[PDB]
Structure 1
């Protein structure tokens, strides 16, 4: 998953799309506790909340993210690469899956980690 925001110090707004193995994946609320976590594999107010299907169902995946007029458009595609050396040639068009209705001041984004 990816943590979208501007400063994350309880002043600007932040977005908290996260993907897990359960059915309920997305939980978007204003928080500042999450700086750099890793998964154990064994504040203020919530402006908008949304729950849907998990998103990341030779396994090259490609995602592009857009921010047009406060709307968060997400496109995705799965590409079965054969030789894993660098970015392969050819074409593979990405497809829309989930369109969020709101997002304010997305400036910096993070990436999550999972360790054993």
Structure 2
């Protein structure tokens, strides 16, 4: 609907007079912000602007998943609400706000002006540790979505930040790390476009590796007569094995275990045996 002018800047630590360049989830300048009480998807953080009492963040909002209610009668409670409170944790006692969820912490930044530009000072870093994919308001107001972008802020009060991905002039300003540019011609780095989608292509394999059968064999070789097997044409899914086989040791050399679910190997050899503790 509308256009956000140069609004939606929040502090991403103390610093002063640094002209610091930071890549984070920011609201692009001159972006589309919707105007509105339905369920509003949260995505990667939101910039809310505006009688409004508070907010309700959550995933299902149906008592099957923890949701957090912020309200003013200031009360913040995270519990399994029906849309009454059981099995739950955190409890506490022109408008603009920015909501982000990083490392289980809900960052809430606030600001108010008598109506431009204004940096939103941090208010809360709540240790909630819940998955937020939807939210609602509790009672005309504008909602915008943050995207990953690189900004160049001035600074310990932020002043006149610039977005590097909107104009050639802004790109030049960001690549020179200065807000005042003299007459001339300068080369610039690519701040214009960054990838958004992903293109995963894996081979046409559907069989599952027989880890369960191998690890459940009734007999194993002596260490001096260790065998070898070639594993091929199967999908290495260790998750199916979490139901058993506690795996008192899972040291991985070269590759990282977390990556083993997104790697393809040309040849896998399994050598099995029995030893002392």
Cα distance, 1:26 vs structure 2: 2.5
Alignment partner, residue 56 of structure 2: 3
Give the greater-gyration-radius structure (CA). 2
Q: What's the TM-score once normalised by structure 2's chain length?
A: 0.29
Structure of higher RCO (CA pairs closer than 8 Å, 6+ residues apart): 1
Answer whether contact 2:64 2:80 (CA < 8 A) is retained: no
Answer whether contact 1:15 1:103 (CA < 8 A) is retained: no
CA distance in structure 2 between the partners assigned to 1:107 and 1:72 by the alignment:
13
Q: Displaced runs of 4+ in structure 1, greater than 2 A?
A: 24-29
Cα distance, 1:10 vs structure 2: 2.4
Task: Give the aligned length.
Answer: 85
Alignment partner, residue 19 of structure 1: 72
Is 1:102 matched with 2:102? no
Answer whether contact 1:28 1:50 (CA < 8 A) is retained: no
CA distance in structure 1 between the partners assigned to 2:88 and 2:60 by the alignment:
17
Describe the superposition over 1:52-89 as per-residue Cα deviations: whole angstroms up to 9, x where unpaired. Answer: xxxxxxxx0110001011100111111111xxxxxxxx
Unaligned runs of 5+ in 1: 35-42, 52-59, 82-89
Q: What's the secondary structure of 1:28's corresponding residue?
A: strand
Higher helix share: 2
Answer whether contact 2:78 2:88 (CA < 8 A) is retained: yes
CA distance in structure 1 between the partners assigned to 2:87 and 2:68 by the alignment:
12
Unaligned runs of 5+ in 2: 1-53, 140-277
CA RMSD in angstroms, aligned pairs only: 1.6
Is 1:111 matched with 2:137? yes
Is 1:47 matched with 2:89? yes
Alignment partner, residue 113 of structure 2: 79
